[model samples]
Target: FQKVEKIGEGTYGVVYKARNKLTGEVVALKKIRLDTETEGVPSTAIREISLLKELNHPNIVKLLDVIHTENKLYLVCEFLHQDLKKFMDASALTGIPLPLIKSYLFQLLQGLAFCHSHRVLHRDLKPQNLLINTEGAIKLADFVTLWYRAPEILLGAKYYSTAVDIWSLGCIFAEMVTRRALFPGDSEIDQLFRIFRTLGTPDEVVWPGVTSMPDYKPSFPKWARQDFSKVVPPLDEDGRSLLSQMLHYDPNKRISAKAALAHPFFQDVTKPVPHLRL
Candidate 1:
């Protein structure tokens, strides 16, 4: 390496910005500490590597390579400039135009569509995990974090589907438009309450199997579902319709990633060019 600089740390290990001496390629290197472990590589690292290896999409962050030193494992990844959180923060100060918001959200959904098609669920998704570069391309990063975790996870449902990621994407998309978290709950219970308050408390009728979940509550305050437009004033009718489908209480009823990509909200955007001919 010609140059290496400490960048940040995550659940597994420290990350660094490194440059290749001969090729002059910049990459983010995640150094995993395997010295302290009695078992093999950490499960988080294994899961990340396994999932990333199987996933190859324009909207998903690319994993370049993995190298090993004496006591640490380094994961090389494509370098990105900023996260969606920073973008949203800047937009908060100086308003984000609606067209740009649509473009970003469309890219995110396209990434999600690929993940769902591959049968990989990104349980954690938020503004912090969405990365952006100078070209204005936003990619899904860090498949880890609990803030944008799905409600089914908070409800203690062991068996869930792509709906979990859908919920997280819904939260992220709303943030892109409003520059604020739709549900900023402090704890698991608070998180459920926040969701319920906005979408109305889910009953047996609303979510047939919800009452059987380990964390289901019988006495939570009932809330009548309200239109999401109030929370995101700039959202138009088609956008609101798509958001509502994603925020559905029943995991089974929630809109699929593929369906979401085909929604009316994305109709005006130019279609993605086919990568190959059949």
Candidate 2:
């Protein structure tokens, strides 16, 4: 394949638009920098590649090939036009239709459930990692990142599980409806506070072990959780209910991706995403 232009960058590499010289097939080459022998490619990249090899789903980005030469490791993947964030920006005023939001959210849960079933954690998920094709289907593009931190991790919990992604799904779902980040923050502490302000600070009553969180301090100011209907008017009761479950203060109590897929929030969208054709 001949390199065309830089397309994007990932946690471990730069991606490029490229084409097969003879076949002219367009593809993306994710190039990873390395300091081999003593160390290997970034562990996350290794996991992303290894995990993609095992995961085969329409909602997950497909990896086609891996090419390595000396210090560079290039991964070939199906080319996608843009990401969820870019689409959200373009749809800022026009608004992302409700059906499309449900479609995207449904597909996200599908991919996430598949991962959990296979015991993989896409610890890092964001709008940037959610790629959109010309047909408007969303496909996940990365293994993990830190911006969408779950309260468990933010409050310094030593361990966590797939519930982390559930929190992120809630964040993304809310963003799709509002075109605004639910907990926009510039720093880690701020991230925790943003969540607290939105959902209210958790405590032994609301979250049994929250007091045990390394960063938990009784002196931290408290704020009541906001009303979801007012915060995201587009979502009816079902949508808000599902989002709240996904964002449960307790990871163990958070909705599983499979259960989320079956939530009433998606009942209306199960028949067909009517707008998909036109």
Candidate 3:
């Protein structure tokens, strides 16, 4: 490395902006430290590499190379501009335009759809995991986090699916419209309460077998659902409709990434033009 600068630190490892001395190429170096000699390579790192190696999509960040040293493993990733969180923060003062919001959300769904098609659950979908390049291309970065974690996981559901990412995507979709977090809860109860208050408390009719979960409780306060139009005033009717479907109480009822890509919200882009038709 000719020059290395720390860009970010997270639960997994430290990401550094590094330059190659020979090629002068810029790259993101994710440094993974071996905490224990007996532990060998961290399982998290192994899982990340294994999954990322199999994933090949334009909307997904590219993992270029892996370097294994005596005590550290460095993941050479494609260099990109600031994350979506930073991008959102920059526009927080003026708010993001609807067209841009639609573009970003569509790209996010495309990445998630690719992952789901491979039967892989991102498990984590938040703004921080989304990286934007100078060309305005938004690619899915970190595949995983706790805040964007699904309610089923919080409720101790062991067998979950890609619906978890859909829920998180709904949260992100709302954030994109409002330029703020949809559910900013500090604790598990707080998070669930935020979701319940927004979507209303779920009953057996909506989410069958939810009550049997290990973390389920009947004592929580009942909350009437809030109107999506009022909750996310910036979103259009179709956008709000799609958001609601994604944030569905039941995992089974939640919209799939493939179906979400076909939602009416994206009609302008997905709809065919009569005049241009052959």
Candidate 4:
């Protein structure tokens, strides 16, 4: 181990910047506390590791190794110089160009496509989950599985699939183009409304069993619809069309991550730079 610095922290763990003992390369290590057998590893964390173990993509974080002692499990990952949140925060004060947005979205789709092909859904996809390397390459991280309101917790219909990740990509794409979070609210209801105000609310007719959700009901507005151009103006015609496909209120019809990769929005993004550093 080499001298390390604290780069960031989150709800589940603390992150450190360290150098590889042999190669002297900088790496980010996540130290997560594991409780006794009663709790074991959170299924979310386990799924994240299990999924990462099988995935090796340029746009996805590379899990270096696992260092286990007695009480904690250390997840060593490729070092990232910045996160989408930090990059966007700085650019918001200034401005972001369109080609850069395309690059970022291209990376996002490429990574999500890989994950979708393997039947893994990155249930939590957000700007904070994206890390930017020093070379300006983006990587998707912070994967998770069943938890609060997760399919297992809801016990409703089991049709949930990779479309969830596509919905999140649409939101993140809007964030990148607008330089602002498209829909951020204080509560779940307010959040739903914020989404409805832009992409409209889901309906049983359009979304089939959407109303059958434990939290979903007829009370959620149906007739409400918003012109998406108001939120994602910078997107090109094809880009907006792709976003519309992913951001569908109907989870059933929403574009799958793999299909989105094949969409015209990414037609010109083939053969992206391989993850060089990680």
- Residue lDDT tens for model 3, 1-278: 74378889977779988898888899888888877774567778677677777789999988887777667887888877678787788777777667777887888899999999998777777888788766657888755355567788888997998999999888888887888788888888898888789888877887998898899999979999999987798687999999999988899999999999999899775211111111
Clashing pairs in model 4, backbone N/Cα/C closer than 3 A: none
Give candidate 4's root-mean-square deviation (CA, Å): 4.3
List, residue by residue over 93-128, the lDDT tens digit for candidate 4: 544566667778887888988888887777787787
- The runs of at least 3 residues in candidate 4 whose Cα sits more than 4 Å from the true structure, single-residue gaps closed, are 37-48, 144-159, 267-278
- What C-alpha lDDT values do all the predictions have? 0.78, 0.82, 0.81, 0.72
> Over the stretch 92-176, how does candidate 2's per-residue lDDT look in tens digits?
8867888788888999999999988988888778898888865657888766235577988888888889999999988999989
Best by lDDT: 2
> Which portions of model 2 miss their true places by more than 4 Å?
35-39, 42-48, 68-70, 144-146, 270-278
Ranking by lDDT: 2, 3, 1, 4
Runs in model 1 deviating more than 4 A are 34-38, 42-48, 68-71, 270-278
Clashes of 3: 0
Candidate numbers, best TM-score first, in rank order: 3, 2, 1, 4
The local distance difference test score of model 1 is 0.78
TM-score of each: 0.89, 0.89, 0.91, 0.85
Per-residue lDDT of 59 in model 2? 86
Candidate 1 has what TM-score? 0.89
Clashing pairs in 2: 124-144, 124-145
> Best by TM-score, which number?
3
Comparing 1 with 2 on lDDT, the higher-scoring candidate is 2
State in Å the error of residue 197, model 4: 2.1
